[PDB]
Amino acid sequence: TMRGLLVGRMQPFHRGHLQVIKSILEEVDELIICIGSAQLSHSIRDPFTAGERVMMLTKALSENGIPASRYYIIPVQDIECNALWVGHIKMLTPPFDRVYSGNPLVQRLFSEDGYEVTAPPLFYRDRYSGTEVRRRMLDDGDWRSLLPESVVEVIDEINGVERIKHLAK
Amino acid sequence: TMRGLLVGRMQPFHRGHLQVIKSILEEVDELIICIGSAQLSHSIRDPFTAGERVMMLTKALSENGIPASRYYIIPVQDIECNALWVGHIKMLTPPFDRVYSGNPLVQRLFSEDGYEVTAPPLFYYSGTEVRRRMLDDGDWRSLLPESVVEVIDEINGVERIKHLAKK
Amino acid sequence: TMRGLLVGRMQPFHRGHLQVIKSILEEVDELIICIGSAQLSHSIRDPFTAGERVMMLTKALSENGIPASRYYIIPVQDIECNALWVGHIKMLTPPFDRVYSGNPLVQRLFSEDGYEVTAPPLFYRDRYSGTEVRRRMLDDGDWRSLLPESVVEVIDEINGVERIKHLAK
Amino acid sequence: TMRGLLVGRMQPFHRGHLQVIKSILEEVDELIICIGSAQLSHSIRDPFTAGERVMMLTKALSENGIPASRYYIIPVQDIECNALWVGHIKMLTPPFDRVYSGNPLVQRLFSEDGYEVTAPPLFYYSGTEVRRRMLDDGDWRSLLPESVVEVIDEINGVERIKHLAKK
Amino acid sequence: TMRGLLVGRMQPFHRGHLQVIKSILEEVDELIICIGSAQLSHSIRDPFTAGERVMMLTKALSENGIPASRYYIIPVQDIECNALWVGHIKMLTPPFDRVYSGNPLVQRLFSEDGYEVTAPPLFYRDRYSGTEVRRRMLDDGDWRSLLPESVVEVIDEINGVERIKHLAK
Amino acid sequence: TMRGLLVGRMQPFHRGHLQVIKSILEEVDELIICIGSAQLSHSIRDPFTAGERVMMLTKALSENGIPASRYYIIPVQDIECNALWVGHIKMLTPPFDRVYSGNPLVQRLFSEDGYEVTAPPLFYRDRYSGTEVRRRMLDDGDWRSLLPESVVEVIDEINGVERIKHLAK
Numbered sequence A, C, E, F: 001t002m003r004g005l006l007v008g009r010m011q012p013f014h015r016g017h018l019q020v021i022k023s024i025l026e027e028v029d030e031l032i033i034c035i036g037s038a039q040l041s042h043s044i045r046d047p048f049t050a051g052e053r054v055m056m057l058t059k060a061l062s063e064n065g066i067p068a069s070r071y072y073i074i075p076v077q078d079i080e081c082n083a084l085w086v087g088h089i090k091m092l093t094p095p096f097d098r099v100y101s102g103n104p105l106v107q108r109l110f111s112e113d114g115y116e117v118t119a120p121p122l123f124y125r126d127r128y129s130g131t132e133v134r135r136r137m138l139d140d141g142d143w144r145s146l147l148p149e150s151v152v153e154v155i156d157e158i159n160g161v162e163r164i165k166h167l168a169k
Numbered sequence B, D: 001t002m003r004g005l006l007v008g009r010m011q012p013f014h015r016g017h018l019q020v021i022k023s024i025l026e027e028v029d030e031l032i033i034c035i036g037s038a039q040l041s042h043s044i045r046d047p048f049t050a051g052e053r054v055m056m057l058t059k060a061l062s063e064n065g066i067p068a069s070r071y072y073i074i075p076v077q078d079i080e081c082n083a084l085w086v087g088h089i090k091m092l093t094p095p096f097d098r099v100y101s102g103n104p105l106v107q108r109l110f111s112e113d114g115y116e117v118t119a120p121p122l123f124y125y126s127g128t129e130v131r132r133r134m135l136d137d138g139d140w141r142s143l144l145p146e147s148v149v150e151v152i153d154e155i156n157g158v159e160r161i162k163h164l165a166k167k
Ligand SMILES: NC(=O)c1ccc[n+]([C@@H]2O[C@H](COP(=O)([O-])OP(=O)(O)OC[C@H]3O[C@@H](n4cnc5c(N)ncnc54)[C@H](OP(=O)(O)O)[C@@H]3O)[C@@H](O)[C@H]2O)c1
Pocket: A007, A008, A009, A010, A011, A016, A020, A035, A036, A037, A038, A077, A078, A079, A080, A081, A082, A085, A102, A103, A105, A106, A120, A122, A123, A124, A125, A128, A129, A130, A131
């Protein structure tokens, strides 16, 4: 059993993330998906709580017919010590074989701990990113079209738009 | 629409826990399952890491016919302040309506925060017996779902607990 | 200006504590009162939150005609490092000259940091202590008579008795 | 019976803050005053310790005619999780009914937790001006209650901030 | 370069520890010595601070002619997650190859992380242990004969006996 | 016995630091050397772990013939409360008499706690500083000539150049 790992803030989870995830699922048996910076919420850059993001991911992966036997969803708080972050991830996750990240720090930390590391198989453009999603939530643009419907429903339930607009005053 | 919450150490996850979970799923649309004391591992009482327990639960709920749309699995570290623990849980979980616990402290903490609280529908198969059988070469496997046994083989759980029990 | 310091869990604040406080106020201009183990609540030994204990002290000292200019009330969480606890107290409090404690560890920590340390001027018996108060709350004894009335009112408002009884099941 | 809450860094406590407080006390029976960012000291922006600020507030509210039965003064450290901060405040404070803040984050956090929230009744005297005058030998004293000036003399606040502003 | 690691509380550092250290130095080029439970001080079981123990070890190893090029002395606080403790040690130390410990937990944690683990080459009897040292400090026994002279000098300077006696009241 | 204290990040330890250390050793019997920001690693500004820096200092001071009896090397994590940092240092170190620092904050914190504070006896120019070392590591300049040979050897073993280059992508 070959297990990959992916880590991202997912503020919020959007179609870009999902596309990356599906691409990774072509080359691993199971994917561990870590929601990074789980401690950060209620800012313009990081509006949603760990729990809200768990909800988004859990619903999105279920709505798209990905079998539950092929993924794990795990919130992970940042820590002060970079040299310990890999150990922190390992404690919170099933054993894994390969890490997917385009981030140099994430790459290097996992590589120094002896893991295989590769870039994600797909890169999405800025117009489909979290920054664009949040900007559209703020400016009454079409944020919904950038997200799976199951994520839009989470955002409606938790009043995500009202939250982010209030925080931008 | 109606979401329940359950919290336990699950050291390890056994057929008892699964029976309770299925029973709760007859009363709620979705169940949030929190793995408590996520920080504790590598002792006789708490042998498995948070990650290992996430793995056990994820596999066990998938192997049994439970749709993924009906549960969430969330590791939760203990904190020093009891008066903050409910807030900690809330931050880490989807919104929920009702808590299932037989533990007086858990009940009272959630009750003071305005949640409906009730005992689990079923009382049972115990973690103490599972761990004792792992230590004494008893039939621990029969107390667990097969998917959990497979996790324990992969992570060398028995060897771990036996080593930790030395002098 | 001569400033004393006193530290206790005050679970809850009872007439014994108050008697000690009044005795200390005969020999200092101002008394800093620290509520220790501020992080502990919702147990048989430590039922009340920091905030609840602040309330108890603030009300009790006001009801008994002690002028506000003569005291400070400060919640203090325990820390893991004993060697740092005095520094932690100092950061959270006004400057002070003398510490009142009968506890050997508290005495020694403050003495090693160069403070004058003395035992409290009065010692109350076990039958008037927090242990007796909590035991009476549990067993339907006369807990009210061990407390100032203003503290009884705090306990009624926060449902302290119901809390402690539930926790003892 | 009706309890308000106010939160600010109070670096230092000045006549502005006191005016706001007196104005709030016309609308509530009791006011909980939280000294925020209690962990920050010894910078140009945040020169004073939690303890020093507790001292300033305690003395200033006593010197002005405010009865002790009408307020509580509580230092509160910042925490990493915004979603926990309200729970943190609640643990450290008496129960309260209404929050006074002009800060959008503070407003929204308390509002999501079910509290009534409103802007302070008065907008003003600023901490930035006080600190600038301490640094540049201006008339900082006139911006503060006399009891606060006395705290700052005792703790050598001016000398501290001047030393910290060096190269 | 073959590097060993040893970890102990060293409350205080005594001749037994030193004997073990010298035996280990016959088998490795360099020895990393970690002072565990660095956060604990001012109790009967753990009287000395991290700093005081660093002082004891530094002085003792220098007085006994062990070259400075052959050891490292590193204080290490305990952490709540056993699954992170090895990562915590690794962050605070030079790279190492082999761990010396008789403790089952320490053995298993390091072993799971891929390190070679072995028992210490020598075991000292109870009569020469920290427990006996501390007991003799309390009861006016001959504690000095159980410690290197350089450690005795540290304990005199920091008033260690006076401390532990006060804490036992 | 007169004991000084020095604190710096030492990212990495270079000849400038060593020169300052030797100058201080003309004025004190013993020097406590604290490695500050011990929690920070794996960034352009702070590339090396606490352990790696302990290794650099231990090797450099031993290669240059400074007797082991004249120094202590101690990693110190930053903390959020400036008013506690001196207490944190004191817990982790032997007792000391005088602090050497050019940093206003460090000076004032120690000074408020009653310590004698002075500037270091020597100031090295920017061209010999950590910033210049790290810049040369990144840009294939002569970084080696700015460090003691023992430190170069540490950096080769831990692949420090490869690390910092990867982190700069
Ligand atoms: N010491 C520690 O605690 C530590 C150390 C290292 C990393 N971490 C954490 O690990 C998490 C992940 O690190 P990160 O740097 O990747 O943070 P991140 O928040 O996930 O940022 C990565 C950036 O790249 C974008 N991105 C990710 N995958 C992409 C793809 N396939 N194509 C295009 N753009 C892509 C993201 O866009 P979107 O805005 O669309 O998501 C985001 O703008 C973070 O929470 C970080 O804080 C923690």
